[PDB]
Amino acid sequence: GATTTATRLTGWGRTAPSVANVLRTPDAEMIVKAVARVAESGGGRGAIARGLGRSYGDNAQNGGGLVIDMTPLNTIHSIDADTKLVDIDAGVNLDQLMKAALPFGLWVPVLPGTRQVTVGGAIACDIHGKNHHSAGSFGNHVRSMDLLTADGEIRHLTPTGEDAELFWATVGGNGLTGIIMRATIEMTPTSTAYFIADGDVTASLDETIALHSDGSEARYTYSSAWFDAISAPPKLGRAAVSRGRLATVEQLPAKLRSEPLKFDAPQLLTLPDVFPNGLANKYTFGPIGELWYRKSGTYRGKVQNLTQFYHPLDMFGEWNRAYGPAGFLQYQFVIPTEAVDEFKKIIGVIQASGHYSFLNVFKLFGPRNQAPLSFPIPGWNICVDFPIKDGLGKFVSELDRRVLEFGGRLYTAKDSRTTAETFHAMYPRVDEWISVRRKVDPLRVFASDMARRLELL
Ligand SMILES: Cc1cc2nc3c(=O)[nH]c(=O)nc-3n(C[C@H](O)[C@H](O)[C@H](O)COP(=O)(O)OP(=O)(O)OC[C@H]3O[C@@H](n4cnc5c(N)ncnc54)[C@H](O)[C@@H]3O)c2cc1C
Ligand SMILES: O=C(O)c1nc2ccc(C(F)(F)F)cc2nc1NCc1ccc(F)cc1
Numbered sequence: 001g002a003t004t005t006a007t008r009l010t011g012w013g014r015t016a017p018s019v020a021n022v023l024r025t026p027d028a029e030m031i032v033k034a035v036a037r038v039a040e041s042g043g044g045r046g047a048i049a050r051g052l053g054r055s056y057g058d059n060a061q062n063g064g065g066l067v068i069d070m071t072p073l074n075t076i077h078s079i080d081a082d083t084k085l086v087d088i089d090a091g092v093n094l095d096q097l098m099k100a101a102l103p104f105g106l107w108v109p110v111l112p113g114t115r116q117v118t119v120g121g122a123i124a125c126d127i128h129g130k131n132h133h134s135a136g137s138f139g140n141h142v143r144s145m146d147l148l149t150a151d152g153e154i155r156h157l158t159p160t161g162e163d164a165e166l167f168w169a170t171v172g173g174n175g176l177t178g179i180i181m182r183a184t185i186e187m188t189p190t191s192t193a194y195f196i197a198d199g200d201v202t203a204s205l206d207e208t209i210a211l212h213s214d215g216s217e218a219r220y221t222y223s224s225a226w227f228d229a230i231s232a233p234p235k236l237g238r239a240a241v242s243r244g245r246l247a248t249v250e251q252l253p254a255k256l257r258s259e260p261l262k263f264d265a266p267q268l269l270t271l272p273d274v275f276p277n278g279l280a281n282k283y284t285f286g287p288i289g290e291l292w293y294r295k296s297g298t299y300r301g302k303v304q305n306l307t308q309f310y311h312p313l314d315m316f317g318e319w320n321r322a323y324g325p326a327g328f329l330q331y332q333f334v335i336p337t338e339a340v341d342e343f344k345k346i347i348g349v350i351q352a353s354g355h356y357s358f359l360n361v362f363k364l365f366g367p368r369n370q371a372p373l374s375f376p377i378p379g380w381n382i383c384v385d386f387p388i389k390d391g392l393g394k395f396v397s398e399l400d401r402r403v404l405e406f407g408g409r410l411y412t413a414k415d416s417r418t419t420a421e422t423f424h425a426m427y428p429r430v431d432e433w434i435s436v437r438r439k440v441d442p443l444r445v446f447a448s449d450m451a452r453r454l455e456l457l
Helices: 026-039 094-104 120-124 164-170 207-215 286-298 306-310 314-319 340-352 392-405 420-426 429-442 449-453
Strands: 002-010 018-024 047-050 066-069 074-080 085-089 142-149 154-157 179-186 195-201 222-227 240-248 299-302 328-336 361-365 381-386
Touching: 018 026, 026 066, 026 179, 026 286, 047 179, 066 154, 066 328, 066 429, 085 164, 094 299, 120 179, 142 164, 142 299, 154 164, 164 429, 179 286, 195 306, 207 240, 207 340, 314 392, 328 392, 340 392, 381 392
Parallel strands: 018 066, 047 066
Antiparallel strands: 002 018, 074 085, 085 179, 142 154, 142 179, 195 240, 195 299, 222 240, 222 361, 328 381, 361 381
């Protein structure tokens, strides 16, 4: 049942609200009609797809225009264990897909830190995960997709076909080449739903960097770390590192061998439920605390399910991103591998800034792909979460400048406030991408708040 409703929209960050007509229909034919209507007009304030709204900024909103909610197009058409291909509507989310694919011994090839994202959102942001250095980003695994363009046609795009240019502009394109209706993804084969993991705890930034540079990364398909962004040096940049690979059946204890592909139910009680007063005791911040933390986060060959290995912060319940009525600003950047001193300088700047981030992701990215607006490049990728308070806006503008100067970039899926000038300098293939977009949407049928702010329109 199709509905068109005026709706106040924000990204996950709950900032920059704007009002748009939100179309919500399970009918593909209706979506086509709306795009044909906008194009007949043709353009006006245009249209943009929206997935599950997990992007923090303004890429899935369109103030004074049309937003098409893609979540009702969520049919899994087929899964094939022999070809390893899945054929699914763009509104299918990655949790749904993971659960449907497991009985075939198939693994979603790129998983982000939350499972509530659409296939369309995964493609449009060319999302990355803990296995980026071994598997690339989501775009690398798309074998085809059906794109509804401004001319009202549906184009079958393939990575190396005749429409490869448009394919690779849609990857990481933030919905600005049209509406992805449907895609075919090549999955990763697996015999189990478990990981075998090694954990390490480092004492400092220099140590965290050495561990990622000593060659050991090549022995793990999956690798990420939490780091300390608050402590003065030398504690600054100390990390709990979690690295592993998917387990094989024989690597499971006998207990788990009868259902190797099973996903366990996320249990009832989290840590806030069990320890409401917190985890701190008289030992926590001294030498016995340091030792305990070091020992508990150091291990070899530990069998873990998805939550344990991949969503380790789920146990922290209501404690993560808590207490702030003002909200938080999520800031994610990557710095080229070779710029290691520069990378260390930026971590120092953050620590000395007087803005405190507790939730810190650290990962070494691998080789980039051919998508001109793709975020990942090989090098040091960082996510930080700053509580909103005075001076933050002007400080993150300074961070932008250092990120840019050091050859790095910000991620559109996280950004709500960088400038067009900074963004364009961070993405030297932006003009190349813009030319593809104007060729495929001369009338700006597709438009968003981000497109206008970053002058991608
Ligand atoms: C807790 C959390 C953890 C995260 N962890 C990671 C991570 O590890 N790695 C990572 O890369 N990202 C991560 N993200 C970011 C997230 O994966 C991206 O923002 C993703 O794009 C969200 O998907 P969505 O379906 O919610 O899309 P939305 O936010 O609704 O839309 C995002 C973009 O995709 C476009 N789009 C959506 N559907 C379509 C379609 N059918 N056709 C064309 N364009 C479309 C939109 O127009 C918009 O430009 C995380 C986000 C959160 C909240
Ligand atoms: O919050 C994010 O936006 C995010 N971004 C990531 C980007 C890259 C990666 C990486 F591991 F791939 F690098 C992990 C991320 N995890 C992320 N978060 C995981 C998370 C965030 C909040 C929680 F409460 C529990 C888990």
